[PDB]
Design a protein around this nucleic acid. Sequence first.
RNA 1: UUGCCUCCUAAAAUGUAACGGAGGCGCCCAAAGGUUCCCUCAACCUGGACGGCAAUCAGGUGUUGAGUGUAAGUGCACAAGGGAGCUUGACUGCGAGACGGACAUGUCGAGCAGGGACGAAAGUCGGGACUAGUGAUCCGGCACCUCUGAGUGGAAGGGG
RNA 2: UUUCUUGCCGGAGGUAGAGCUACUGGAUGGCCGAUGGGCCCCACAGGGUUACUGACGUCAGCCAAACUCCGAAUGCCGGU
Lengths: 136, 79, 182, 49
Amino acid sequence: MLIPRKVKHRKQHHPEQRGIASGGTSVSFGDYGIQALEHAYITNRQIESARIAINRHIKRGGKVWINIFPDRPLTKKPAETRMGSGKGSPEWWVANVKPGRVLFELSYPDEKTARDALTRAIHKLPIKARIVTREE
Amino acid sequence: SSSRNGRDSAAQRLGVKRFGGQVVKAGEILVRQRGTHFHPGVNVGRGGDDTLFALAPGAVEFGAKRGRKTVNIVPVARP
Amino acid sequence: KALPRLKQRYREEIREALQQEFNYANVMQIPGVVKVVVNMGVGDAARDAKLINGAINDLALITGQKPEVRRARKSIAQFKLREGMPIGARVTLRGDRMWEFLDRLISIALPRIRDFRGLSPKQFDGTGNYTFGLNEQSMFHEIDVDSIDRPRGMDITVVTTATNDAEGRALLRALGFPFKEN
Amino acid sequence: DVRPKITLACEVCKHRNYITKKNRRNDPDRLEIKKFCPNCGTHQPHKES
RNA sequence: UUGCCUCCUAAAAUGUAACGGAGGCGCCCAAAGGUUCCCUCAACCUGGACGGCAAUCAGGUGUUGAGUGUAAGUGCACAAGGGAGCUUGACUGCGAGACGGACAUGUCGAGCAGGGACGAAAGUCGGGACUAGUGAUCCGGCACCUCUGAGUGGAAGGGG
RNA sequence: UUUCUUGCCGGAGGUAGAGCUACUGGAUGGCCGAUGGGCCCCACAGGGUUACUGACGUCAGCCAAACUCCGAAUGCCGGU
Ligand SMILES: [Mg+2]
Ligand SMILES: [Mg+2]
Ligand SMILES: [Mg+2]
Ligand SMILES: [Mg+2]
Ligand SMILES: [Mg+2]
Ligand SMILES: [Mg+2]
Ligand SMILES: [Mg+2]
Ligand SMILES: [Mg+2]
Ligand SMILES: [Mg+2]
Ligand SMILES: [Mg+2]
Ligand SMILES: [Mg+2]
Ligand SMILES: [Mg+2]
Ligand SMILES: [Mg+2]
Ligand SMILES: [Mg+2]
Ligand SMILES: [Mg+2]
Ligand SMILES: [Mg+2]
Ligand SMILES: [Mg+2]
Ligand SMILES: [Mg+2]
Ligand SMILES: [Mg+2]
Ligand SMILES: [Mg+2]
Ligand SMILES: [Mg+2]
Ligand SMILES: [Mg+2]
Ligand SMILES: [Mg+2]
Ligand SMILES: [Mg+2]
Ligand SMILES: [Mg+2]
Ligand SMILES: [Mg+2]
Ligand SMILES: [Mg+2]
Ligand SMILES: [Mg+2]
Ligand SMILES: [Mg+2]
Ligand SMILES: [Mg+2]
Ligand SMILES: [Mg+2]
Ligand SMILES: [Mg+2]
Ligand SMILES: [Zn+2]
């Protein structure tokens, strides 16, 4: 449930989602990480569910890094309302992800359950992603 | 449910409207700007509203002078 | 055709003692006293500014030259203070006035201090600077006790050209204010 | 009205030439400045009506 | 909501809409005008009792982070910043030439003549460091004028 | 032919993109951490002798139509 404490302006236009991610293309906080493939809108609830999944499997050891923060807001009017008449209220905050961006980072000893937990996180995200190690 | 925004102002059509390398008349206005984006040089005067104009005939030349943007009018040679 | 006794002491023995005792490369590396500033801020002018005139009179009898009234550069709604009221007094002693005032202080006030235990050495900021604040204000002999109505503040400030704390120690101890021993 | 509109009149030829705005709360007294009156030919102080 | 001003949307000349996103305006200054001159902060470590976390502060790293009437925007430390001395150019008569416009509208401007302001003089003075603070037509009032005056002087009336 | 097109010459921008120990905000994990700018005994003197808080700094890695220490291709204006 990652939500920014405050934002200077509470509503923003439709973000551009074109191009290839340049920042955060390589993983360096730990050993293991996950890299995305397609363009997407990844929501804070999805981040929360994925982090819950990672910890819910890795248990005692290790720790998690998250390289993204869902601070981009989106509006939605309630149903049974004619279109127009101003903007709707913001419902969920999203983090726009570009291809190849590193989403989560792990540092746990053994490859078996490391890859297992990373896959556990993969299966909860809406877009394709792959395992990447610290070695290039 | 309604909105309280939606009002705006007019457009006063600001900006640089005379560029370098051309010939300008006496008293010709060069740049319309709010503050000091440009600065006066030789033969350049400043109006009440921080506009820049020419005092002499010639050709406008932009330049840089100690981290500043200044405009000048060179005395083009009489044919 | 006149020269103060403390200035005489400084130019005869204090500078040569300092010079020989720290072995400076040149002679005028001797530290020297720079400015003497005398002032105080009442703080209650936000409610009553009448006592500012009394503070001015007190300063006038203390230094002999007219003080100042200055405002506050910021507004504090919590203190019920906005920019524009005069907050305190100001006056400065310079030159012969420095030497005469330092004489008067060291020779009249410090011996008389009620329950004087000296002054600690540890109130410098590393380069020999020292301004500070006193139990009672009526202490100088130039002011009379019968005409005072409330305890206000007053000032005795000495400063140096000193580069750091070593010569601050040296010159302040040569001059001889009641430094504590620890 | 906070902002009365007062006119400035000349003396020798007595012409209501200039007009200016002022705050009567802050300026109870009359306005005293100098201006140039065109028909006179010389500067002469103006008094408000 | 209907007028005006600030920014973005506005795609690096101007422009460019929506019941798109954020805010303000129908003043103030006889000084907050003008001349000339003096000087530069705030951030900073320490404390004769209050007085402390901050009052004022000297020392002495400190190129703007304090700030420059009223929102935003641009600048301004080379000041448009603070103070002081004097004094009203918030002139008249204008206006080369320009921006700017469907049209009525808005903006700048060297120079000449009279009398001044500051400074010895050089020099500067056609409101406020700038951009919002605003309203067409008709009809009615007042001062002054070597304008006219329904057959004689006029005057009324009609004019500026 | 003053028009248009093209080559070259003289031009200011502030979009795309990228970036932050460069400003306005957002954000992940460490290190000394004196002094929570502070509390197991309040000593005017031994520590979270106790899992906190830990500022400044620092290691680094991101995001912003109303952020630009940077900044194109286009288009626009003028001359040959
Ligand atoms: Mg980046
Ligand atoms: Mg998926
Ligand atoms: Mg003006
Ligand atoms: Mg002006
Ligand atoms: Mg020093
Ligand atoms: Mg007039
Ligand atoms: Mg704008
Ligand atoms: Mg433009
Ligand atoms: Mg249209
Ligand atoms: Mg409003
Ligand atoms: Mg003045
Ligand atoms: Mg000082
Ligand atoms: Mg001024
Ligand atoms: Mg000033
Ligand atoms: Mg003309
Ligand atoms: Mg002129
Ligand atoms: Mg003249
Ligand atoms: Mg009508
Ligand atoms: Mg007749
Ligand atoms: Mg008749
Ligand atoms: Mg008549
Ligand atoms: Mg031809
Ligand atoms: Mg180019
Ligand atoms: Mg360029
Ligand atoms: Mg800009
Ligand atoms: Mg971009
Ligand atoms: Mg920063
Ligand atoms: Mg990086
Ligand atoms: Mg956009
Ligand atoms: Mg940008
Ligand atoms: Mg364009
Ligand atoms: Mg061409
Ligand atoms: Zn007259």
